[PDB]
Design a protein around this ligand. Structure first.
Ligand SMILES: CCCC[C@H](NC(=O)[C@H](C)NC(=O)[C@H](CCC(=O)O)NC(=O)[C@H](Cc1ccccc1)NC[C@H](CC(C)C)NC(=O)[C@@H](NC(=O)[C@@H](N)CCCNC(N)=[NH2+])C(C)C)C(N)=O
Lengths: 99, 99
């Protein structure tokens, strides 16, 4: 589909057996999801943005369905203000920027 | 053009007559440029992102060329990690997300 940018590009995603609303972010290298009790192994990581860094838990090989599109990859979990789908998963669903 | 996301969606912009590199950020409401001298009056403003809030100088109706495309609108100038083009100007040049 095509998503205009008048409003924030939000879509429904499915992760860890839960449905959430996430922002498609071309300016994000990684995918960061709100605090979740995901099962399995993880490793500590620090991700940064506009006002600084936040501590997150890195889970590899996480299956996420983005707007009906399945993808598998690394998902960072932590105190993010919003669920962010980064380029790491956007590339997997074949998302492009067009103008 | 059509921009895939295997690499950061960076483009060349022209602001204040100076060329700079900026990231097309669909996850940014506003356009934030690194500290620079810009012709025009401004008012203090504060924006937030991952990590927190930062103080920026808000310049209104700023002429800016993004990858050969022209936009005229609000440009926030402050200590951002990288120059980012938000939805405010992305919509002006007709950018959409497609998958
Ligand atoms: C005058 C303005 C008034 C309006 C003002 N608006 C805002 O504050 C709104 C909500 N902010 C935003 O939309 C900001 C961008 C700034 C802006 O647009 O102003 N967006 C953002 O900050 C979005 C995430 C987000 C979206 C919505 C809400 C909260 C957060 N992230 C943008 C950001 C771009 C990056 C190049 C700087 N990406 C990231 O932060 C991602 N990080 C990464 O991709 C890292 N790997 C990058 C390298 C890290 N290293 C380093 N920094 N040294 C992260 C999501 C994993 C307000 N105060 O409400």
């Amino acid at each position: 589909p095509q998503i205009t940018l008048w409003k924030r590009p939000l879509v429904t995603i499915k992760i860890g057996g839960q449905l959430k609303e996430a922002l498609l972010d071309t300016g994000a290298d990684d995918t960061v999801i709100e605090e979740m009790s995901l099962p399995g192994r993880w490793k500590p990581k620090m991700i940064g943005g506009i006002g600084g860094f936040i501590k997150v838990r890195q889970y590899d090989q996480i299956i996420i369905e983005i707007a009906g599109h399945k993808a598998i990859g690394t998902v960072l979990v932590g105190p993010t203000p919003v669920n962010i789908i980064g380029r790491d998963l956007l590339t997997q669903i074949g998302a492009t920027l067009n103008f």
